[PDB]
Design a protein around this ligand. Structure first.
Ligand code: BZC
Length: 350
């Protein structure tokens, strides 16, 4: 059958799980009877973003109440929703509009996964697992448990778990070394920058076929800048628990996936409060939201010339900021080089 190693086989199955894709859409309150997985279109999603962009403008700029109603009706007609025996809420407040922009970010990845899964299964000689694997265009290898890399990664997970994020425990089930096709070449010029760190990136399991085949992506130009704190960029953290919260796991579904990527930060543009940034000031390569807590600088190590902030959660002293923990944002897709994929087990405490 499958030529792949057991853990990789189980990773592929989890990634392309159809039931999970539907569960995600249901959580987003989408009407699966009026809009099944097969109906999802790229241009459909793209248009929904532009509708959200306009309605966001109308609300913030004091638009006519009739325009907001019109935009609301157009949005729900485009993407059928199921609100029960409840009245459909209008897209009239920035927080609901924000929630909808994020639904679209996820649908963009779900659509990719379903499209990959659906076509190209014309072999027979090759096992279905192998075929889907090749669709990812990503070389995946299991990292040795009693390795030096693994030891360093486990230390990073254990030491960087946030204090306020103790609604669960975390166990590293498997660590995979991943290499997306052509990504190392895309990232090559940034090897010239200083301050290259190994940072975390959490996401729903349903987003991984898109992340692996397309890479980490920045929100589309049609998207409202408002739906993203520090503008439209790629977000990372130095505390495993801050990113792990973005996996959206539960006690009924405790297995999450998280990435470790080498990110070329260079000279950081340090911010204490949110800012819908459009472009970097001269001499800046990234943004750094300052948090009240961050890893112990004395404990910072190296893994292939890349800094690994694995020290224990220490008080930064920059205790006059909005953020409780740091945030790292890059506005160039080529400034990131994915290295590891970890399969985590969230042990929700009672
Ligand atoms: C889920 O949609 C959004 C929208 C805006 C910002 C974000 C957002 N994601 C992260 C992550 C991460 N994903 O690992 C880490 C640190 C800060 C972050 N902010 C997510």
């Amino acid at each position: 059958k499958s030529k792949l190693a057991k853990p990789i086989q189980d990773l592929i199955k989890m990634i392309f799980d159809v039931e999970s894709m539907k569960k995600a859409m249901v959580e987003f309150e989408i009407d699966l009877q009026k809009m099944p997985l097969g109906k999802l279109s790229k241009r459909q999603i793209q248009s929904a973003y532009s509708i959200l962009n306009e309605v966001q403008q109308a609300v913030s700029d004091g638009g006519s109440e009739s325009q907001i109603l019109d935009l609301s009706n157009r949005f729900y007609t485009l993407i059928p929703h199921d609100f029960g025996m409840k009245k459909p809420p209008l897209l009239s407040n920035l927080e609901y509009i924000q929630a909808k922009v994020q639904m679209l970010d996820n649908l963009l990845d779900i659509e990719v996964a379903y499209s990959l899964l659906r076509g190209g299964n014309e072999d027979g000689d090759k096992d279905p697992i192998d075929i889907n694997y090749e669709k990812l265009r990503t070389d995946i290898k299991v990292v040795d448990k009693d390795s030096e890399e693994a030891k360093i990664i486990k230390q990073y997970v254990k030491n960087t778990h946030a204090a306020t994020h103790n609604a669960y425990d975390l166990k590293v089930v498997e660590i995979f070394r991943i290499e997306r096709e052509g990504e190392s070449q895309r990232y090559k010029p940034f090897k010239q920058l200083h301050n290259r760190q190994l940072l975390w990136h959490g996401s729903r399991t349903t987003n991984f076929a898109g992340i692996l085949s397309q890479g980490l992506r920045i929100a589309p130009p049609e998207a409202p800048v408002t739906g993203y704190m520090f503008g439209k960029g790629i977000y990372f953290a130095d505390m495993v628990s801050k990113s792990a919260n973005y996996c959206h796991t539960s006690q009924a579904d405790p297995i999450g996936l998280i990435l470790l990527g080498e990110v070329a930060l260079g000279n950081m543009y340090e911010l204490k409060n949110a800012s819908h940034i459009t472009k970097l000031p001269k001499g800046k390569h990234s943004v750094k939201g300052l948090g009240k807590t961050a890893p112990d600088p004395t404990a910072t190590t190296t893994l292939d010339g890349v800094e690994v902030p694995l020290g224990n959660g220490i008080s930064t002293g920059i205790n006059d900021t909005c953020l409780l923990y740091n945030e790292y944002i890059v506005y160039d897709v080529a400034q990131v080089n994915l290295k590891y994929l970890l399969k985590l087990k969230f042990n929700y405490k009672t």
